[PDB]
Amino acid sequence: SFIEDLLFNKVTLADAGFIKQYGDCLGDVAARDLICAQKFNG
């Protein structure tokens, strides 16, 4: 899908497997809410 690349380009040096634990999905850090906005790409 289109969205998968934009997701990758955010976590490029931050890593999505770290963000899964370190982002509780408050949504103040709107940038890092991409694991819950696109529901972890699935």
Side-chain angles (χ1 to χ4, degrees):
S1 195
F2 68 94
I3 199 77
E4 316 197 18
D5 300 36
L6 209 90
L7 266 34
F8 243 80
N9 275 123
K10 198 289 168 295
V11 301
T12 192
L13 269 86
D15 308 296
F18 177 48
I19 298 168
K20 170 168 164 69
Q21 291 187 305
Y22 209 78
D24 222 67
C25 305
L26 282 170
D28 194 289
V29 63
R32 204 188 289 182
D33 209 65
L34 76 174
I35 45 151
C36 273
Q38 202 71 30
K39 296 182 100 280
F40 216 76
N41 208 355

Coordinates of all heavy atoms in Angstrom, one line a residue:
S1 N 0.7 -1.3 0.0 CA 0.0 0.0 0.0 C 0.8 1.3 0.0 O 2.0 1.4 0.3 CB -0.9 0.1 1.3 OG -1.9 1.2 1.1
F2 N 0.2 2.5 -0.4 CA 0.9 3.8 -0.4 C 1.5 4.1 0.9 O 2.6 4.7 1.1 CB 0.1 5.0 -1.0 CG -1.1 5.4 -0.1 CD1 -0.9 6.4 0.8 CD2 -2.3 4.7 -0.1 CE1 -2.0 6.8 1.6 CE2 -3.4 5.1 0.7 CZ -3.2 6.1 1.6
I3 N 0.7 3.9 2.0 CA 1.1 4.3 3.3 C 2.3 3.7 3.9 O 3.0 4.2 4.8 CB -0.1 4.1 4.1 CG1 -0.2 5.0 5.5 CG2 -0.4 2.6 4.4 CD1 -0.6 6.4 5.2
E4 N 2.7 2.5 3.4 CA 3.8 1.7 4.0 C 5.2 2.4 3.9 O 6.0 2.4 4.7 CB 3.8 0.3 3.3 CG 2.4 -0.4 3.2 CD 2.5 -1.8 2.9 OE1 3.6 -2.4 3.2 OE2 1.6 -2.5 2.5
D5 N 5.4 3.1 2.7 CA 6.6 3.8 2.6 C 6.8 5.0 3.4 O 7.8 5.3 4.0 CB 6.8 4.2 1.1 CG 6.8 3.0 0.2 OD1 6.1 2.0 0.4 OD2 7.6 3.1 -0.8
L6 N 5.7 5.8 3.6 CA 5.7 6.9 4.5 C 5.9 6.7 5.9 O 6.7 7.4 6.6 CB 4.3 7.6 4.4 CG 4.3 9.1 4.6 CD1 4.5 9.9 3.4 CD2 3.0 9.6 5.1
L7 N 5.3 5.5 6.4 CA 5.6 4.9 7.7 C 7.1 4.5 7.8 O 7.7 5.0 8.8 CB 4.8 3.6 7.9 CG 3.5 3.6 8.7 CD1 2.7 4.8 8.5 CD2 2.6 2.3 8.2
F8 N 7.7 3.7 6.9 CA 9.1 3.5 6.9 C 10.0 4.6 6.9 O 10.9 4.7 7.8 CB 9.5 2.6 5.7 CG 10.1 1.3 6.2 CD1 9.2 0.3 6.6 CD2 11.5 1.0 6.2 CE1 9.7 -1.0 6.9 CE2 12.0 -0.3 6.6 CZ 11.1 -1.2 7.0
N9 N 9.7 5.7 6.2 CA 10.5 7.0 6.1 C 10.5 7.8 7.4 O 11.5 8.4 7.7 CB 10.0 7.9 5.1 CG 10.6 7.6 3.7 OD1 9.9 7.3 2.7 ND2 11.9 7.9 3.5
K10 N 9.5 7.5 8.3 CA 9.5 8.1 9.6 C 10.4 7.4 10.6 O 11.2 8.0 11.2 CB 8.1 8.4 10.2 CG 7.9 9.4 11.4 CD 8.4 8.9 12.7 CE 8.5 10.1 13.7 NZ 9.4 11.1 13.4
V11 N 10.3 6.0 10.6 CA 11.0 5.2 11.6 C 12.4 4.8 11.1 O 13.1 3.9 11.6 CB 10.2 4.0 12.1 CG1 8.9 4.5 12.8 CG2 10.0 3.0 11.0
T12 N 12.9 5.5 10.1 CA 14.1 5.1 9.4 C 15.4 4.9 10.2 O 16.2 4.0 10.0 CB 14.2 6.0 8.2 OG1 15.1 5.6 7.2 CG2 14.6 7.5 8.6
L13 N 15.6 5.7 11.2 CA 16.7 5.5 12.2 C 16.1 5.4 13.6 O 16.8 5.0 14.6 CB 17.6 6.7 12.3 CG 18.8 6.6 11.3 CD1 18.4 7.1 9.9 CD2 20.1 7.3 11.8
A14 N 14.8 5.4 13.8 CA 14.0 5.3 15.1 C 13.5 4.0 15.3 O 13.4 3.7 16.5 CB 12.9 6.4 15.3
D15 N 13.3 3.1 14.3 CA 12.8 1.7 14.4 C 11.4 1.5 15.0 O 11.1 1.9 16.2 CB 13.8 0.8 15.1 CG 15.2 0.8 14.4 OD1 15.3 0.5 13.1 OD2 16.2 1.0 15.1
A16 N 10.6 0.9 14.2 CA 9.2 0.6 14.5 C 9.0 -0.4 15.6 O 8.1 -0.4 16.5 CB 8.4 0.1 13.3
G17 N 9.9 -1.4 15.8 CA 9.8 -2.3 16.9 C 10.1 -1.7 18.2 O 9.5 -2.2 19.2
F18 N 11.0 -0.7 18.3 CA 11.1 0.2 19.5 C 9.9 1.0 19.7 O 9.3 1.2 20.8 CB 12.3 1.1 19.4 CG 12.5 2.1 20.5 CD1 12.5 1.7 21.8 CD2 12.8 3.4 20.2 CE1 12.8 2.6 22.9 CE2 13.0 4.4 21.2 CZ 13.0 4.0 22.5
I19 N 9.4 1.7 18.6 CA 8.2 2.6 18.8 C 7.0 1.9 19.3 O 6.2 2.5 20.0 CB 8.0 3.5 17.6 CG1 9.2 4.4 17.4 CG2 6.7 4.2 17.7 CD1 9.4 5.3 16.1
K20 N 6.8 0.6 19.0 CA 5.7 -0.3 19.5 C 5.5 -0.4 21.0 O 4.4 -0.4 21.5 CB 6.0 -1.8 18.9 CG 5.1 -3.0 19.4 CD 5.2 -4.2 18.5 CE 4.7 -5.4 19.2 NZ 3.3 -5.4 19.4
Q21 N 6.7 -0.5 21.7 CA 6.8 -0.4 23.1 C 6.8 1.1 23.5 O 6.2 1.3 24.6 CB 8.1 -1.2 23.7 CG 8.1 -2.7 23.5 CD 9.3 -3.3 24.3 OE1 10.5 -3.0 24.1 NE2 9.0 -4.4 25.0
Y22 N 7.4 2.0 22.9 CA 7.7 3.3 23.5 C 6.7 4.3 23.2 O 6.7 5.4 23.9 CB 9.2 3.9 23.1 CG 9.8 4.7 24.2 CD1 10.4 4.1 25.3 CD2 9.6 6.1 24.1 CE1 10.8 4.9 26.4 CE2 10.1 6.9 25.2 CZ 10.6 6.3 26.3 OH 11.0 7.0 27.4
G23 N 5.7 3.9 22.3 CA 4.6 4.8 22.0 C 3.3 4.2 22.5 O 2.8 3.2 21.9
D24 N 2.7 4.8 23.5 CA 1.4 4.3 24.2 C 0.1 4.8 23.5 O -1.0 4.4 23.8 CB 1.3 4.7 25.6 CG 0.9 3.6 26.4 OD1 1.7 2.7 26.5 OD2 -0.2 3.5 27.0
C25 N 0.3 5.6 22.5 CA -0.6 6.2 21.7 C -1.6 7.2 22.2 O -2.8 7.2 21.9 CB -1.5 5.0 20.9 SG -0.2 4.1 20.0
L26 N -1.0 8.2 22.9 CA -1.6 9.4 23.4 C -2.0 10.3 22.3 O -3.0 10.9 22.4 CB -0.5 10.0 24.4 CG -0.5 9.2 25.7 CD1 0.7 9.6 26.6 CD2 -1.9 9.3 26.5
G27 N -1.1 10.5 21.3 CA -1.4 11.3 20.2 C -1.0 12.8 20.3 O -1.1 13.6 19.3
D28 N -0.4 13.2 21.4 CA 0.3 14.5 21.5 C 1.6 14.4 20.5 O 1.8 15.3 19.7 CB 0.6 14.8 23.0 CG 1.0 16.3 22.9 OD1 2.0 16.6 22.4 OD2 0.2 17.1 23.6
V29 N 2.4 13.4 20.7 CA 3.4 13.1 19.6 C 2.7 12.4 18.4 O 2.8 11.2 18.1 CB 4.7 12.5 20.1 CG1 4.4 11.1 20.7 CG2 5.8 12.3 19.1
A30 N 2.0 13.3 17.6 CA 1.3 12.9 16.4 C 2.1 12.3 15.4 O 1.8 11.3 14.7 CB 0.5 14.2 15.9
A31 N 3.4 12.6 15.4 CA 4.4 12.0 14.4 C 4.7 10.5 14.7 O 4.8 9.7 13.7 CB 5.7 12.8 14.6
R32 N 4.6 10.1 15.9 CA 5.0 8.8 16.5 C 3.9 8.0 16.7 O 4.0 6.8 17.1 CB 5.9 9.0 17.7 CG 6.8 7.7 18.0 CD 7.6 7.8 19.3 NE 8.7 8.9 19.2 CZ 9.5 9.1 20.3 NH1 9.2 8.7 21.5 NH2 10.6 9.7 20.2
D33 N 2.6 8.5 16.4 CA 1.4 7.8 16.5 C 1.1 7.0 15.3 O 0.1 6.3 15.1 CB 0.3 8.9 16.7 CG -0.9 8.5 17.5 OD1 -0.7 8.3 18.7 OD2 -2.0 8.5 16.9
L34 N 2.0 6.9 14.4 CA 1.9 6.2 13.1 C 1.7 4.6 13.3 O 1.2 4.0 12.4 CB 3.0 6.5 12.1 CG 4.5 5.8 12.2 CD1 5.3 6.2 11.0 CD2 5.2 6.2 13.5
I35 N 2.2 4.1 14.5 CA 1.9 2.7 14.8 C 0.5 2.5 15.2 O 0.1 1.4 15.4 CB 2.8 2.5 16.0 CG1 2.9 3.6 17.1 CG2 4.2 2.1 15.5 CD1 3.2 3.0 18.4
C36 N -0.4 3.5 15.4 CA -1.7 3.3 15.9 C -2.7 4.0 14.9 O -3.7 3.4 14.5 CB -1.8 4.0 17.3 SG -1.3 2.9 18.7
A37 N -2.3 5.2 14.3 CA -2.9 5.8 13.1 C -3.2 4.8 11.9 O -4.2 4.8 11.4 CB -2.1 7.0 12.7
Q38 N -2.1 3.9 11.6 CA -2.3 2.9 10.5 C -2.3 1.5 11.1 O -2.2 0.5 10.4 CB -1.3 3.0 9.4 CG -1.8 2.3 8.1 CD -2.8 3.3 7.5 OE1 -2.9 4.5 7.6 NE2 -3.7 2.7 6.6
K39 N -2.6 1.5 12.4 CA -2.6 0.3 13.2 C -1.4 -0.7 13.1 O -1.7 -1.9 12.9 CB -3.9 -0.4 13.2 CG -5.1 0.6 13.8 CD -6.4 -0.1 13.7 CE -6.8 -0.7 15.2 NZ -6.1 -2.0 15.4
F40 N -0.2 -0.3 13.1 CA 1.0 -1.1 12.8 C 1.0 -1.8 11.5 O 1.4 -2.9 11.3 CB 1.3 -2.1 14.0 CG 2.8 -2.4 14.3 CD1 3.5 -1.4 15.0 CD2 3.4 -3.5 13.9 CE1 4.8 -1.6 15.3 CE2 4.8 -3.8 14.3 CZ 5.4 -2.8 15.1
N41 N 0.7 -1.0 10.5 CA 0.5 -1.4 9.1 C -0.3 -2.6 8.8 O 0.0 -3.4 7.8 CB 2.0 -1.4 8.5 CG 2.2 -1.1 7.0 OD1 1.2 -1.0 6.3 ND2 3.4 -1.0 6.5
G42 N -1.3 -2.8 9.5 CA -2.2 -4.0 9.3 C -3.6 -4.0 9.9 O -4.0 -3.1 10.7

